[PDB]
Design an enzyme around this catalytic site. Structure first.
Site, PDB file in Angstrom:
ATOM      1  N   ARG A 145      12.539  17.935 -16.736  1.00  0.00           N
ATOM      2  CA  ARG A 145      12.593  17.124 -15.719  1.00  0.00           C
ATOM      3  C   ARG A 145      12.619  15.577 -15.986  1.00  0.00           C
ATOM      4  NH1 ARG A 145       8.635  19.627 -11.757  1.00  0.00           N
ATOM      5  NH2 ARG A 145       9.011  21.624 -12.869  1.00  0.00           N
TER       6      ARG A 145
ATOM      7  N   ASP B 190       8.155  17.161   5.969  1.00  0.00           N
ATOM      8  CA  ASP B 190       6.598  17.916   5.817  1.00  0.00           C
ATOM      9  C   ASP B 190       5.814  17.449   7.077  1.00  0.00           C
ATOM     10  OD1 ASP B 190       7.446  19.229   3.174  1.00  0.00           O
ATOM     11  OD2 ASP B 190       6.797  17.059   2.226  1.00  0.00           O
TER      12      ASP B 190
ATOM     13  N   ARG C  25       7.454  19.179  10.087  1.00  0.00           N
ATOM     14  CA  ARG C  25       7.067  20.584   9.975  1.00  0.00           C
ATOM     15  C   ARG C  25       5.507  20.912  10.225  1.00  0.00           C
ATOM     16  NH1 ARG C  25       9.129  24.668  12.058  1.00  0.00           N
ATOM     17  NH2 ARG C  25       8.430  26.664  11.305  1.00  0.00           N
TER      18      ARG C  25
ATOM     19  N   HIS D 177       5.461  13.061  -2.042  1.00  0.00           N
ATOM     20  CA  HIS D 177       6.342  14.324  -1.603  1.00  0.00           C
ATOM     21  C   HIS D 177       6.386  15.572  -2.445  1.00  0.00           C
ATOM     22  CE1 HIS D 177      10.463  16.117  -0.684  1.00  0.00           C
ATOM     23  NE2 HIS D 177       9.781  16.499   0.420  1.00  0.00           N
TER      24      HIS D 177
END
Lengths: 310, 303, 310, 303
Positions: free
Chosen positions: C85, C145, C148, C172
């Site tokens: 990553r 988010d 939602r 996030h």
């Protein structure tokens, strides 16, 4: 973008109401001799905008018409008891003589969109006064009748209105012409298409439709005193075509060098409307009787311009 | 109102996205053998909806299609390929109509004209009830390019692409109207007389679109997704608008029982009328020819 | 108005699609080093437009971004086999080093809208490179988010989503903070509203809902590999806010001088979004617990960015 | 869906116009004693619809209200007027529910709070089913002026005007919220301190709006027309959004059986919930008094 409106009676205010509810422009400016009529309407409408679109409606002077890309002229006066036609006409002609120069002073580059009845003559009056190119002065003309014609036709045929192509030309009024003959549906002859189906348009249907179109304004005025809701929205659409430089085709009135032999008169033909006003005419096939009803509509209109001197 | 989509690949999920963004339907059900794929697209799209319209996008089974008034078939897998897809439809169509006997079937699967014919035969429904996306993208692109050239709004341009969707589709230059007057006569009045190289330039833009998109990205889906959504809107609102969509038609230029795009009236029962344009000898010959290869492709397949 | 998008993968292209279908800007320009990819996407989307709104979607160069008022940065590279990553983050930070100056060269007045994950670090990167005021570089952050969270609360309370005010703040992702304590509905505190509604919101309901918000991205990636439709529409809304100088409040990521003591770090807080980007931050009441989760979210981002060189 | 409008004056007709341009319902039916007035307004509006949305506006009798989910009562008659109008409602209310038994009644007739109580008694319906427009305009104006002052989107401002529509309505400054945060705090963050002077300016802006409009033009209709259309839409879409509308209320600050505006959840069945905000002593006391005067007015008129 800014839209201006001069004349804040029912027609000017409903135009502002339509502009706002449809969110056509960010700014709408109401201008009227009666400063506080303009203010009451503007503030009434501002109370509506939270329930629709962010649109700044305000009352204003000609100076506040600065940078307006379109200015609606719905100016004029409230007719008087026993005030004759020609009389009211001369009065509105003189209102325009004061309005036009002032608008063009604040907003040199605005298309002028004339609403005041009779719309064809007031269009010609504003054209002459403006000293602009003829495309910059556009009258709402027959647009509501054209659309009403399309609607009634689409109904009888059972197709979407937007599939029906059909015009009302000439004078916005008694002598307007329904172009039955080159009307189309999806690009093909309309009367013929109807026929190939259930039933062809009958004599009774044709004149039920003609009467639906032609005597609408009379019915409305008979029952409520004046029309304004219909034209409010039609004007908003035209404003929208101008602000977005759509170049759509609309049956609007403008100064036209010659039509059917008649010379230098304003009347409705199919025209291409964009950021600089009408920028092209689209003359459709006419039948001999439509052609002749049009010459005749033109001449009636030419003579009414004479009586005013425009 | 509920809309169904069978096949949750790019075409199907893009249709769901366009449906949701445009707010065409309150409920959209994605159905796919790969359930987890359908659920992921459904949920992804559901996150979009707060930023557009209240639309419930979800994954479900065939049975979750009950009461759907339109169902999109985007379930695609040479005419071996075309064979595999017909097998799929032999599964899909019966199961959709089981849960939703009322649904208009909207065929998206390539080749769309053949698959529209097979969906029709399999359906046992009347012919207007099975409608293929057909040539709608090409017709609109044709009008778009003409509008640009002429400097007029596309809605004033009435021009068609007809026949088989793809290489052999017929651009109908001959009877194209604008403002209700002949294209070429309008074109000159705009000081832009259409030139055979203009005509050929535009042709290239319509005909080769799909090939360019596939070369660059491997598949097309954004365009047809919105086109299908517009078609679904027409069905749900009983619009009776004219669209060049593919449907089983009794005869076209002599060729009998073939599916292909003509200008058709589209409403709540599917297509309910044809508006047949004027064609020139060349175009007609092209069209009849188009109709012929399609007729026997269907015939090779047993349809 | 013009909007630019750099990076024409699934996020950038889905964004172009959402902008076109919602009619947000008159012109959308996709810029990708992989030109045939950008071109394929632009033309696929251009074919959608006759069925929605007149929008000119096209692929182009940085030079074609000129006059753009918002440019979405969805730029980046595909993770290679056996790459960490953090290795990927390196390569992406380097993509931004090339992108940012070229965008600003051509559209020096554009608000920058960062979408590439991890959006918070990448926002910090875009901000440092840009040389712009903090308000000009905005990451999409937690808007999905937050949206939602509100939808789920809505459905549970049986109330319109736009009546529910709940925030997801911070980084996030897994570390994000659902702000339960100060969430309100109809102006008043969530938890009584639920009470005076005949829904108490057991701890099991909050757990259900927390999983709904927090674990959405994971579920989507597991079923289809990537997310893009959601953020495509989220980004389009942020763009609309910028183009209309809306000054609406959104939980988006921006460079923040100090949060819970952590200094110079980018993360989502409630922010006022207008024509110049973020122009104000609205700090909601936070519970000891949320505050410590936020503080801790901030310091892991602070470290990650510094470790990256930002 | 169908919406009924009884009373075809400027309020009733502006409402239909608002409903049409915004494309809220597919059928709009106008009902008035002066049949020709209703027919004229309807036909005038029908001419607008081609330039907005496909909506069928028409004049009609009570019988044509069949299946209407919402019916607007803007039937105030031109000028003891109270009694007068109270009789009208005794005629109107029974007729409407006869055609439209699930119809939410939406009272626009002034004074709206008593009429809402009147309509409720006669209704024989659950309390939520009768809803008066109340202070929705003033609440929205209050938010608009605050948004303007604080440089923030109106959507972010959560502020109410409550109580009796009119000169004794209560601006709830105390518990107002922007972006979730107390108003005055948010003003700080904005560097835009809300001083007594600023609040007075804003109060006048809200409270004296209708007065100013009446003076310049004689009556108000454009604003309430769009506000009613939004309420209608909330009902037709079963939104369950929060609006400061007037409804019959068991008790408010101890006053019993009175109708006035509070934040209420509005859906397909009318109001289905009350959201009671924090009130300062001043506000609570002002609301209490307003509610007294109303419950009295209600009782003395016979309701």
């Amino acid at each position: 973008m800014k839209v201006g409106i001069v004349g804040s009676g029912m027609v000017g205010s409903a135009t502002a109401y339509a502009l706002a509810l449809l969110g056509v422009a960010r700014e709408v400016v109401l201008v009227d001799l009666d400063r506080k009529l303009a203010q009451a309407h503007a503030e009434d409408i501002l109370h509506a905008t939270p329930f629709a679109h962010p649109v700044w409606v305000r009352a204003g002077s000609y100076g506040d018409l600065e940078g307006a890309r379109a200015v609606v002229l719905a100016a004029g006066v409230a007719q008087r008891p026993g005030e004759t036609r020609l009389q009211l006409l001369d009065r509105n002609a003189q209102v325009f003589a004061q309005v036009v120069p002032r608008v063009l002073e604040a907003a040199p580059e605005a298309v002028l969109l004339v609403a005041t009845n009779p719309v064809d003559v007031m269009t010609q009056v504003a054209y002459r006064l403006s000293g602009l190119p003829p495309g910059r002065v556009v009258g709402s003309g027959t647009i509501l009748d054209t659309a009403r014609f399309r609607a009634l036709l689409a109904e009888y045929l059972r197709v979407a209105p937007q599939s029906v192509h059909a015009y009302v030309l000439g004078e916005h009024g008694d002598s307007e012409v329904l172009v039955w003959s080159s009307a189309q549906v999806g690009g093909v002859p309309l009367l013929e298409f109807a026929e190939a189906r259930g039933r062809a348009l009958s004599p009774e249907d044709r004149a039920r439709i003609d009467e639906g179109v032609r005597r609408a304004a009379y019915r409305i005025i008979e029952g409520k005193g004046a029309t304004y809701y219909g034209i409010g929205a039609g004007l908003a659409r035209l404003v929208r075509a101008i602000l977005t430089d759509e170049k759509g085709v609309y049956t609007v009135s403008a100064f036209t060098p010659e039509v059917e032999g008649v010379l230098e008169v304003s009347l409705s033909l199919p025209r291409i409307l964009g950021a600089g006003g009408v920028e092209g005419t689209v003359y459709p096939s006419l039948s001999p009787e439509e052609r002749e009803a049009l010459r005749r509509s033109a001449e009636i209109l030419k003579e009414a311009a004479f009586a005013l001197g425009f």
